[PDB]
Every structure is written in C-alpha cells, then in structure tokens.
Amino acid sequence: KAIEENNNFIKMAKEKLAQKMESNKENREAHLAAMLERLQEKDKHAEEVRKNKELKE
Amino acid sequence: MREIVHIQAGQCGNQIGAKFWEVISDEHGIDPTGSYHGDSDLQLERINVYYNEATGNKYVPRAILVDLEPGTMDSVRSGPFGQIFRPDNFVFGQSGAGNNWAKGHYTEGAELVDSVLDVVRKESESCDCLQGFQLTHSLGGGTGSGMGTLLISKIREEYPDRIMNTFSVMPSPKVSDTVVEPYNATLSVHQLVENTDETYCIDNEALYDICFRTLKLTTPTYGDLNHLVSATMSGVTTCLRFPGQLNADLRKLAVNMVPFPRLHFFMPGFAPLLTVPELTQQMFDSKNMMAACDPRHGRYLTVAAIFRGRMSMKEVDEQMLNVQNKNSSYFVEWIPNNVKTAVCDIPPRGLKMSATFIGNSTAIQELFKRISEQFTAMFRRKAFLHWYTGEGMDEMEFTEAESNMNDLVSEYQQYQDATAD
Amino acid sequence: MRECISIHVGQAGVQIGNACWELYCLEHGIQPDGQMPSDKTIGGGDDSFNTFFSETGAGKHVPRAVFVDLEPTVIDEVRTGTYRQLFHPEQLITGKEDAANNYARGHYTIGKEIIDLVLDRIRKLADQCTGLQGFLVFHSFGGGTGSGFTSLLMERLSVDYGKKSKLEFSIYPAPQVSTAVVEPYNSILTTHTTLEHSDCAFMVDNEAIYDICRRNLDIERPTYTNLNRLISQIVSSITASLRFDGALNVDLTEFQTNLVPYPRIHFPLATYAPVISAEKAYHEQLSVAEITNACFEPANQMVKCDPRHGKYMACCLLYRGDVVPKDVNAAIATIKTKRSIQFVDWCPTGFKVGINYQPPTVVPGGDLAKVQRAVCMLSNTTAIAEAWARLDHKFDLMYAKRAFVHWYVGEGMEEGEFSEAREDMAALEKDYEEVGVDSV
Numbered sequence A: 001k002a003i004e005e006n007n008n009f010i011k012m013a014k015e016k017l018a019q020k021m022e023s024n025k026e027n028r029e030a031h032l033a034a035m036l037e038r039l040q041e042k043d044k045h046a047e048e049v050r051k052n053k054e055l056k057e
Numbered sequence B: 001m002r003e004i005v006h007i008q009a010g011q012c013g014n015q016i017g018a019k020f021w022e023v024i025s026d027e028h029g030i031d032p033t034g035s036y037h038g039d040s041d042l043q044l045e046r047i048n049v050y051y052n053e054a055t056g057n058k059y060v061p062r063a064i065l066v067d068l069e070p071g072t073m074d075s076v077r078s079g080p081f082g083q084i085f086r087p088d089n090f091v092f093g094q095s096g097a098g099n100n101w102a103k104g105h106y107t108e109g110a111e112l113v114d115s116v117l118d119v120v121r122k123e124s125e126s127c128d129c130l131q132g133f134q135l136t137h138s139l140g141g142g143t144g145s146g147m148g149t150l151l152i153s154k155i156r157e158e159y160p161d162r163i164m165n166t167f168s169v170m171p172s173p174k175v176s177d178t179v180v181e182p183y184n185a186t187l188s189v190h191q192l193v194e195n196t197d198e199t200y201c202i203d204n205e206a207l208y209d210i211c212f213r214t215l216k217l218t219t220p221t222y223g224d225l226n227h228l229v230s231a232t233m234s235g236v237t238t239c240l241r242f243p244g245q246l247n248a249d250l251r252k253l254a255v256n257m258v259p260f261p262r263l264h265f266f267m268p269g270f271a272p273l274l275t276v277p278e279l280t281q282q283m284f285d286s287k288n289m290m291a292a293c294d295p296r297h298g299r300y301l302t303v304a305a306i307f308r309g310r311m312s313m314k315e316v317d318e319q320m321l322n323v324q325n326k327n328s329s330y331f332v333e334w335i336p337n338n339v340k341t342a343v344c345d346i347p348p349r350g351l352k353m354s355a356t357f358i359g360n361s362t363a364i365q366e367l368f369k370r371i372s373e374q375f376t377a378m379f380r381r382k383a384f385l386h387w388y389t390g391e392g393m394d395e396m397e398f399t400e401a402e403s404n405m406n407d408l409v410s411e412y413q414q415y416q417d418a419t420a421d
Numbered sequence C: 001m002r003e004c005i006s007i008h009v010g011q012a013g014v015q016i017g018n019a020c021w022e023l024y025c026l027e028h029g030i031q032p033d034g035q036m037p038s039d040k041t042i043g044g045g046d047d048s049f050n051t052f053f054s055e056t057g058a059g060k061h062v063p064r065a066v067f068v069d070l071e072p073t074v075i076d077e078v079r080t081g082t083y084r085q086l087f088h089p090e091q092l093i094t095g096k097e098d099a100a101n102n103y104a105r106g107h108y109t110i111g112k113e114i115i116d117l118v119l120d121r122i123r124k125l126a127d128q129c130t131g132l133q134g135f136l137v138f139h140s141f142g143g144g145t146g147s148g149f150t151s152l153l154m155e156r157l158s159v160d161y162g163k164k165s166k167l168e169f170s171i172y173p174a175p176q177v178s179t180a181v182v183e184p185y186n187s188i189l190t191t192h193t194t195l196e197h198s199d200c201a202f203m204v205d206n207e208a209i210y211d212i213c214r215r216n217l218d219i220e221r222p223t224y225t226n227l228n229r230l231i232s233q234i235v236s237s238i239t240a241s242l243r244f245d246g247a248l249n250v251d252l253t254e255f256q257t258n259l260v261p262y263p264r265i266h267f268p269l270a271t272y273a274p275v276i277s278a279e280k281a282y283h284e285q286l287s288v289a290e291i292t293n294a295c296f297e298p299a300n301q302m303v304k305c306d307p308r309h310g311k312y313m314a315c316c317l318l319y320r321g322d323v324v325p326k327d328v329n330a331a332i333a334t335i336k337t338k339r340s341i342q343f344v345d346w347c348p349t350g351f352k353v354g355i356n357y358q359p360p361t362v363v364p365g366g367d368l369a370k371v372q373r374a375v376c377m378l379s380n381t382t383a384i385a386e387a388w389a390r391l392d393h394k395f396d397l398m399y400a401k402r403a404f405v406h407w408y409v410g411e412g413m414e415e416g417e418f419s420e421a422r423e424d425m426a427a428l429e430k431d432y433e434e435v436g437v438d439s440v
C-alpha cells in the first residue's frame, strides 16, 4: 500500500503535468494563430485598397 | 534580452531620433566617428542595447532611418552625429507623401516598406537576443504617420513575440496649422491601439505650452520642442541604458505598466525643465506633463518614476510615499503598489539632479477627445476626403477609426469609474 | 551520506545562494578555491559537512548545488565573482530570455526549453550521492522564474525522485524592495501548484527583513546585499543541524516531525536573535535568556504576523554557540510565565531544543556583530496565515478587474488556473483557521 500510493502520486503528477503542458501549447498556438490571421486580414484589405485605386482610373 | 532596434520614420521621427542619438552618444562617451572616450565602466556595461560593435572598436547605432522625402537624408548626415550612422541603413523613397496617410500606409509607402524590412531583418538577425523595437514618429504627417503604422503591423508579422514601442508625436494647431492632421492621428491611433505594447504620447500642445510658459520663449521653433523630447526619451531609456541593480527588459516594464492590452498610452513628464521633495512635486504636477492632460481629471492605473543623480534614496522613498498618501484618490485602489521608482547614479549632461515620469492615467482620454473633436469637425461634413478616398480607401474605415478611438475613451472612463468593493 | 542538494532558482534564489555558500565556506574553513586544509581525508569522506559539499581528488570541496535562472546577468556574477572556482560550470545554468515577472513564461513558455537540462544537471549531483536526503529550493514568490520555473521544477522532482523530501526557502514579496506590480498573482499561482510537492517551506518576508536591517543594524535604506546576509544567517541556523557534528545537536528532519501536523500545514514561522551592530554589541554580551526572550518579540520574525493573537502547534529552538541545556531550560521557564504562548488543545506544549557548539560566523565587512551565541526559533503558528491573507487580498483586488491577466493568457494560461489557485488559497486559509479551533 505504501508503494501503490507513492506510485499513484508519481503517476498523477506526471499526467497532470503532461495535460497542462499540452493544454498550454494549444492555447498559446491558438492565441498566436489568431494574431497572425488578423494581420493577414489587413494584407487582404490593403490589396482591395490598391485595386480600388487602379480600378478607378 | 538586450538589443533594441530603433526606427525613425518621417521628418518628425528623424529629427527627434537625431536628438535622441546625440544625447545618448554623449552620455555613453561616444564621439561622431564612434569611438569610446569616457572614463566609467558604466557607460559600456549596457552599450549593446543601442550600439553594434564594428571592427576597430567602432560603436554604431542600431538605427534605421526611413522617409519618403529625400533631403531629410542630407540634414541627418550633415548634423552633429551624421557620420556615426550606418550608410546602408538609410532607406529613403522618391516623391514624398505630402501629409497624406493613405499614401504612406496603403500605396506609396507600401512600395518602399519591403526595402526597410530588409534593413530591419539584417539588423535583427545579428542581435544575440533582440528584445524589441522603438519607433520615433509623428501621427500628424504622412510617412511617419502612415508608413510608420504599416511598419508596425509588418514588423508584428515577422516578430510577434518582440515588444513594439512607439514615441508617437501627437499633432497640435498651435505648433503646426496643416488642416488634415486630425485625420492622420485618428487613423494612426486605430493601428496603435491594436499593434503596440506601449506608446509614449509626446504631445506638441504640451511642448508648446511648456516652452512658452516655463522656458520663457515667445514663439518656439522645433529645436525648442526637441530639447524637451530628447530629455524625455533619454529619461525613459535610462533603465535599459545604465546599470543600477534593476534587472528589467522591455517586456518586464510593459508587464508592470500595462494592465489592459489596449490601454498602453502613457503620459510622459520631466523635471526640472534642486532638492528631492521639489522634483517629486514637479514631476507629478500637470505643468511638467509632455502630454496635455491633467492627472487630477482622472486616475493613475500605474506610474513609473526614474530619478538621476547623486541623492538620498531614503529621501526618495519618503517622498514617493508622501505624494501617494497626499494624492490617494488619484491612484486606482484595485491595483496595489502601482507607483514604482528607480534611481540612477549618472545624471544627464547639464543637470546635477533630474526626474523622468511615465504615467498610465485614464486622464489621457483628454488627449484622445481633443483629437476626436478636431476629427469630427472635418469628417461630419466629408471635408478633404478626396485626398484619402482617391488613394483607394473606403468611408467605412474612417468610421472604424473614429469608433475605435471612441471605444478607447469609453474604456479609459470605465476603469476610472471602477471601484474596489 | 545524508546528502542535501540545494537548488537556487531566479535572481533572489541565486543571490541568496551566494550569501549562504560564502557563509558555509567561512563556517567550514573552506577557501575560495575550494580547498579545506583541516580536511585530512582527500577526495571524499563521511563527515557532517559533506552533506553539503562533495570532494574532488584534487581536494576541492564542491557545493552540492545547482543555480538556475532564465537570463545570464545574475549567474554571470557567480562565474566571475569571488567563488568562481568553487562551482563546476555545469552547476551554473542560464537561459537567454527571462520570465518577465510572468509565472506563465517561467512555467510553460520559456521554462520548458531548459527544464530537461536542469533535471539532467540535478541528476549528475544525485548520482554523486550515496544516501540522498532531499532538496532545498531557494526562490522568490514574485519573480516569473522564481514562481513559474520553481513550480515546474518541483512537479518534475516529484516524478523523478518520488517522495524524497523537498524544502523551500520562499521569498515573500514586499513593495519597498520590489518593482513588480504583478507579484500577488505569481505568488498565489506558485503557492498553489507547489503545495502538494513541498514537505516544509520557510517563508521570508522582505519587509520583515527590511525592518530588521533598518531598526537593529541602523542601515538607512537596506539593499539586497544587506537582506541576503541576514537571510543566510537564518538559513545557516536552520541547516547547521545537517552540516555539524554534535552531542546535543538535533536533526532538521526531527524538528519537521513536530513542525508539520498535516501535509498542507508546512509553513513554520522563523525568528532569529540577536541581530545587532558592532557598535551596540561592544561591552554588551547577550545571554541565552536575552536571545531566547527576543524570539518571542515579533519585531525579530522573518514573516510579519502576530503569534500573540494566534495559536501554537509547535515551538523549536535551534541554538548555536556557547549554550548549555541548563541555561535554555531556565530561560524557557521565565518565558512560559511572562509571555503569550497559547498552544492548541491537541498538541503538547513542550519546547523542542537543539544546540550546535560551532559559534555563528560573520561575512567579513558585514553589518552583523560577531556574537558568542545565537538562536533561531522555528514555530508552527496559525498566525502565519495572516501572510496568506494580506497577499490573497492584493490578488483579489486586481483579479476582479482582470488587471494584467492578458499577459498570462497570452503565454497560454487560462482563467481556470487563476481561480483554481485562489480557491486552493481560500482553503489553505480555512485550514489554518480549522487547526486553531478546539476539539469536541
């Protein structure tokens, strides 16, 4: 029972840590994905501005 | 995190940068060729933040000097520290902009922007550990206003995890009478709110009022305004430029100063334009604010204060507690210990004791409202839109820039009205 | 054997490490180069001081310690400083980019790049050991590395080393010496995530230490140099039981038995005496009775709280220097009658005592007077929850408006983690409340 419970603590620590570290990497990537996509939305708007100058002449 | 990459965009940006680089080269004991001639180790200990080490012990600014107008290239190269800059880092366009934001942002500046990014990339690739970027510019012009905010958004793409700071010069009818400057500032603010980590509101109205009423000059040139900006910019960079046990980089400072991502518009201040209690009262006084707003008309979310010169630190501790006690209502209760202080041994050239002030106050809305009033005077009657809709823009985007700035003001007000209980 | 591996995380850990190691060297006659002339057994040995120092065949006594930090500037001054020869280069581990006063960068973003290396370097020190007892982890609550990387390390050390004991020397923040507005968040997060993985944690309130350096040492505006020298004496008093041979010496693990009644209740109040300047100490010998009486004066505590308006669960007196049991007993009888020492009904009221004969030493050109005797009281009092409360209030004020929370969310954290940590602290406060209440 001393072994069983020492192992259980090591087991659930290891899994609890792995779960958080993967959750964080999802979140940080999802944050940076949104930031770049809003910046790529600008480059598409700036392509409509430069087309509406040449398609008004 | 040590190396910062400087960018000076437009006429305003290049001249305030020139003055910035003159003062700090002098402080670090660097002559216009670029050799160390000082005495103290402290001048070299964190030299790498602003200077690259070329062959033959040559210290060269990590500056990128950018404009759509030539001629500004000549004035900077002819000026007192023109020789010290890197020749390749000069990246100057052809036909200028002529106080037009849609030229700088969407068309004419967009053509030059890739040749700037090349110089940025070349500078950043050499950095052992790049921390961030600082942009000196005006928000009333065309190039620095528009191409500057494009550079911001473009640098964010290739460096999303570096800090982006701006010394953004706010336009004013008293200094410059160009009629469209309220359009340019409002469009810039729509970018800055989204794409910068902290923006220093260097305001031309306050600089005019200080130069007139304190420094005694009857009608001041741009050189008179810049002596104040270079003093501010020297002060707010002293943390990184000098030792002192402080161990902070652009991110630490931005973490401790910026409690909400959109609310990163600081109110600078300097003192004197002397004993420690006087300094401490002078810097918190509305007359010394380089942005034209009254702290007493709102509340401080956070404050940073840096002191320079030989002085008792016990006295500085007693005095910063003194004004916090005496002015308790003007600091939000729901962020404890939000007024922090550093002290620097080395004073600036000329003054034995100085004191620089950074303040994230909700009163900064008084600057954004003034611009919003000047803006809506012209917009509601559709004035001068042929300058902007000609170069390809839509009326929708003008409404978004007005709406985003009116939200920022509503948010600054929300937290001013917030209470602990 | 009974080896002890010290881990120093972040600026505050690193710099307190310097203070402690420089002090241990002076206590054991170890020179800066690492040699120990009084050590006749070259290359190794089973002596008391070998619990903190391994020996090389060249006679170098090398600290069983790893210094970690996520930026170089602080650990650079150990690599170039007076004790550069004392440490192997592999013991001093740096990154390039710091945690920026952000628990998230320390625990996840920047931290994960260096964590496997740090455990590898701890593992080389662990395989030098024939009977590893555990780890002492020095760090701040408020720093990004001190909070975030420490938590991460502690989680990993529970995996790699099982239930092998882990002690903390945790620096509790104070706005006098801190430039960090977000420390309350970092403190509650690290405290939450470490709680399961630490067996005993000695908190040090920088304000408490600040007020002592002002009051007792007449230092107008104390620096970290001043604070760390004091701290290291308290740390030295606590680790002296592991480092020294003695008849009346009691092991630190024996005190722990008395100090920790339940697993979460592992935060002993420390109090030290005498802290006195050279001027004041001259023609002024402080007896056992005077320094023992000083332990119950709350001005001398490492954490600002009031034991007198709380309840005792343990009281340990760690004496060093010219002290004999007779004098200690006399002093304790005087204190019992004259002072506010109220125990809970479920504990026994006896004071536990240990005596080390090696007298306390001072760092050359310090502020502390060299005294013939000294004492560090480790008591388990419900009063220490006050420290949690003050800090938990600062947390709540900012979190209600989500001030600064974006900086944590941007580096991958959720709001779930914030409130989860606060709820754990709400329970910890409620536990300290519960232990004080009388039985039925």
Ligand SMILES: Nc1nc2c(ncn2[C@@H]2O[C@H](COP(=O)(O)OP(=O)(O)OP(=O)(O)O)[C@@H](O)[C@H]2O)c(=O)[nH]1
Pocket (backbone or CB within 6 Å): B009, B010, B011, B012, B013, B015, B016, B068, B069, B096, B097, B098, B099, B100, B138, B139, B140, B141, B142, B143, B144, B145, B169, B170, B171, B172, B175, B176, B181, B204, B207, B222, B223, B225, B226, B229
């Ligand atoms: N404080 C300060 N303001 C300046 C200086 N030079 C210009 N300005 C202000 O900057 C605003 C106009 O922006 P400029 O920098 O001249 O324009 P630009 O960004 O170079 O754009 P273009 O002129 O279109 O190439 C006006 O409100 C001026 O008062 C200076 O040296 N100091």
Ligand SMILES: Nc1nc2c(ncn2[C@@H]2O[C@H](COP(=O)(O)OP(=O)(O)OP(=O)(O)O)[C@@H](O)[C@H]2O)c(=O)[nH]1
Pocket (backbone or CB within 6 Å): C009, C010, C011, C012, C013, C015, C016, C069, C070, C098, C099, C100, C101, C102, C139, C140, C141, C142, C143, C144, C145, C146, C147, C171, C172, C173, C174, C177, C178, C179, C180, C183, C206, C224, C225, C227, C228, C231
């Ligand atoms: N007692 C003591 N406290 C310190 C020392 N250095 C820093 N602190 C305190 O520690 C807290 C700040 O965290 P640091 O440990 O400096 O930061 P860090 O752990 O290096 O983490 P980052 O710098 O954010 O990556 C503040 O409360 C400081 O006052 C020291 O040498 N001694």
Ligand SMILES: CC(C)(C)c1nc[nH]c1/C=c1\[nH]c(=O)/c(=C/c2cc(F)ccc2F)[nH]c1=O
Pocket (backbone or CB within 6 Å): B134, B165, B166, B198, B235, B236, B237, B238, B239, B240, B241, B246, B250, B252, B253, B254, B256, B257, B304, B305, B306, B340, B341, B342, B358, C179
């Ligand atoms: C007073 C101190 C503790 C140093 C502090 N705490 C939070 N902020 C500060 C001070 C500053 N905070 C800043 O964000 C800051 C900005 C800044 C600094 C540079 F070095 C370069 C460019 C900048 F925009 N300059 C500062 O001097």
Ligand SMILES: [Ca+2]
Pocket (backbone or CB within 6 Å): C039, C040, C041, C042, C043, C044, C045, C046, C047, C055
């Ligand atoms: Ca030996």
Ligand SMILES: [Mg+2]
Pocket (backbone or CB within 6 Å): B010, B011, B067, B068, B069, B072, B096, B143
């Ligand atoms: Mg121009």
Ligand SMILES: [Mg+2]
Pocket (backbone or CB within 6 Å): B247, C010, C011, C071, C098, C143, C145
């Ligand atoms: Mg640090």
